[PDB]
Design an enzyme around this catalytic site. Sequence first.
Site, PDB file in Angstrom:
ATOM      1  N   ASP A 459       0.756  -1.234  -0.024  1.00  0.00           N
ATOM      2  CA  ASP A 459      -0.102   0.015   0.118  1.00  0.00           C
ATOM      3  C   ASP A 459       0.875   1.204   0.070  1.00  0.00           C
ATOM      4  OD1 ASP A 459       0.220  -0.871   3.129  1.00  0.00           O
ATOM      5  OD2 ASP A 459      -0.057   1.252   3.165  1.00  0.00           O
ATOM      6  N   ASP A 666       1.716  -0.975   8.802  1.00  0.00           N
ATOM      7  CA  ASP A 666       1.455  -1.046  10.196  1.00  0.00           C
ATOM      8  C   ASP A 666       0.552  -0.031  10.605  1.00  0.00           C
ATOM      9  OD1 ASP A 666       3.432   1.278   9.722  1.00  0.00           O
ATOM     10  OD2 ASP A 666       3.339   1.225  12.044  1.00  0.00           O
ATOM     11  N   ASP A 670      -5.096  -1.042   9.442  1.00  0.00           N
ATOM     12  CA  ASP A 670      -5.012  -2.118   8.715  1.00  0.00           C
ATOM     13  C   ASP A 670      -5.717  -3.608   9.283  1.00  0.00           C
ATOM     14  OD1 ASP A 670      -3.223  -2.558  10.645  1.00  0.00           O
ATOM     15  OD2 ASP A 670      -1.665  -2.462   9.086  1.00  0.00           O
TER      16      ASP A 670
END
Length: 783
Positions: A459, A666, A670
């Site tokens: 991402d 992180d 998520d």
Amino acid sequence: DDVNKVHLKLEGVSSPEDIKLIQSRLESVEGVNNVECDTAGQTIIVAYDPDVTGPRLLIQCIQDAAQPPKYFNASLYSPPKQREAERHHEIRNYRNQFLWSCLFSVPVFMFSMVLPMISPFGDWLFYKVCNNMTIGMLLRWLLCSPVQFIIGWRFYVGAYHALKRGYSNMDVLVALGTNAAYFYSVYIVLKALTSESFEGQDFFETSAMLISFILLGKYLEVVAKGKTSDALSKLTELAPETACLLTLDKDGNAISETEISTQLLQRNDVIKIVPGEKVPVDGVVIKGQSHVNESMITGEARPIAKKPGDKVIGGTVNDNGCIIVKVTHVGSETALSQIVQLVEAAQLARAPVQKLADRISRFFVPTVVVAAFLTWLGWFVAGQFDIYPREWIPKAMDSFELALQFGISVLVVACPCALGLATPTAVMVATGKGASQGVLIKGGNALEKAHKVKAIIFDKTGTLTVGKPSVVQTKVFSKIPLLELCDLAAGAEANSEHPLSKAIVEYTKKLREQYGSHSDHIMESKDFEVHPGAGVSANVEGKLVLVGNKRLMQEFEVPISSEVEGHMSETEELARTCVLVAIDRTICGALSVSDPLKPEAGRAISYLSSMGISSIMVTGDNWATAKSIAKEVGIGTVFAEIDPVGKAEKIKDLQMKGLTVAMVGDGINDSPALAAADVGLAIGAGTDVAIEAADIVLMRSSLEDVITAIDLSRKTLSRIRLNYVWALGYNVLGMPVAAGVLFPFTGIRLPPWLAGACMAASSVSVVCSSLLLQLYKKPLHVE
């Protein structure tokens, strides 16, 4: 302890008088709730408050209460890295046990292998003392009784546990082997002593040597455990035990810079960190300025520049300057202390491959004993009825001796105990060697699942972003009054701050022309209007730099005329994607938004393609931006306008096709997709919050270590499988030959003195094979 039910008997304390000498000042001084009274019951358990009126006050009361025969000096009962003392004692124990084992083992082997070949020493050993039994067997028996009876105690104690429960394990076999050999030697000695007609041979070298090397193997295992634990510990500490206490209330009236332990400086107590005084603790730092190689308040060298006063405190060694701390909570509840606990629990836990080891061992040990039993009856009955040549029998024994001799040989040539001393140490060493790189595994299950991977979900956000807003990313093409519009000029975009509105506030900070502050009006929130995509616009200036989205443009006046679509295509092609703006309530002017990438992404993607796994990334932005990023990177399937929920359906879809897929990142949001994914592996380590929904946790921020994690997992699985291949190859040939299918046609079999050696030889090599994992290196030495 010494926190709630504090109890201390420090130097000089030998009687209740000194105990009361501590007591009288310790407990009487405030910070107690006085849970009952044991009336001088030694360790009187009363309540205490170690939070505010705690360590400093209690400990200094201990000293000032004392009048010296030794002057009590704060010897609080606390773990000295209790792991360090613990594995110190454990290594001491096993090292000493092995070293006292060899003390008997090495003699016996010599006296009955090497010494007999040389004289007159063997001639002394042949001196009869009764019938045919001689000095040799006497001293051999005497020397080999300790080796099993005293030193070998685990071999029996552990076996009884398994046997009583209805299962078995390595111990079981080893114990049976050595016990059978010893009692057979006792049997052979009795025959020698009763009758002088008999001259049989003994076996004690096996019972010594086998036990010695097995103990050596256990020693190597615990040494590996100690190394892994210490490699963890050095990373978990990162703090000096003592901090300098410049006592002052919040700011001002600095009394004096002392130096005491980092639990005595909490609750508005102050550290005046001087250069070189590594940042030990947490708790708001209201004053000071230090750019040290970390993320708390800054100002000496490496430019991050937090003004004194900010809520993050931890960090590394210093530079030219100082800070004045205002601790509210020291760096003790920090995550590291319970990463230790969590990785210990994971070590306590195990993987399917570890579960695989037990199941095979479950239906293997019974087989070996049965086969050893069967081969006994074969030679015996055939011997009794004399159905085969007698000349095959060597001199000085009969067929019965051969039968039992083969019986022993099978029982001592089995598994080199790889299944139990190779897997549980390889799995462990892998974790430590990874921890040396910061990256930490979360037990063997993580290793297996990470080893099974062919797809990665990336991402953009916080994984491939840097961020530099300017004309290439955030400002006008037309004229702008009150330029370059930050300090008192552009309040037109300071309305609804979020991760991007603050960037819209900060590119103005970056670009302020050359003057300091033109200082006109800043009318924030006058005509305050919020709309998704761009929720900031009021009235102020910047040629009326209001900013807006698909609902604010045509709202004010902005017709989004053709020039904005031109500057949209142009910007999107150059990845400098525009964001709609309402300059002077008109289409004039055109903002942008762009993002630099971390400069190893190409390396990482290329090398991941080299291993041959698929790379996938998703975005929340429009399709065109994601496509441009794909062109830059060279990635496969691409998704855009995606929420973490959408990430969850994509992860599920990839998995249901039969694909084990990982994801990177992180950003705690998520968590749905993070748990939904096969594994964890969150980049840019935070705390155990990541561990909550992830298994792999990567420590640093470089994308490089992601390669390292999967590489190490693959290496570990390959090594374990190779060890199993060896443990099958050796074991499938050892059993027949020792049982004897070569002697009937060649006349060669292994005497138990040498048959046990192969069992001993393999056990060392298998463990030594596993230990070589520690020489692992980076697959990419800075690409």
